[PDB]
Structure 1
Amino acid sequence: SKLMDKSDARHCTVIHSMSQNGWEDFAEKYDLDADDIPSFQNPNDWVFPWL
């Protein structure tokens, strides 16, 4: 894509990070199997020592 509004882009990927209860909520909303825990490329790092 060579436009600021990204209108030339023919695809886009949005990464969703959600807590466990958020995972069951998402699975119920989209009719997914909550047992199979998903995984993807991790958008955020652990540079800060979060608990």
Structure 2
Amino acid sequence: ACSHVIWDSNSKLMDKSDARHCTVIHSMSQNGWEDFAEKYDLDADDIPSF
């Protein structure tokens, strides 16, 4: 979580309830990306980045 969920919305408290972003990141295997592009319906031949 230290390196995947990131949310400096200038949130000034512990449950980050005053936040408005909270962008999280996924790392996944090839087969995982195919199955992910399956669920959320996406071009499996795109290949993402971050």
Normalised by the shorter chain, which TM-score bucket?
Answer: 0.7 to 0.9
CA distance in 2, matches of 1:10, 1:20: 31
Gaps of 5+ in 1: 40-50
Alignment TM-score, normalising by the size of structure 2: 0.75
Gaps of 5+ in 2: 1-10
Alignment RMSD (CA, Å): 3.3
**Radius of gyration: which is bigger?**
1
Total equivalences in the alignment = 40
SS in structure 2 at match of 1:15 = coil
CA distance in 1, matches of 2:46, 2:21: 26
Q: Of 15, 20, 26, which residue of structure 2 is paired with 1:16?
A: 26
Alignment TM-score, normalising by the size of structure 1: 0.73
Identity %: 98
CA distance in 1, matches of 2:42, 2:22: 21
Q: Of 30, 33, 51, which residue of structure 1 is paired with 2:40?
A: 30
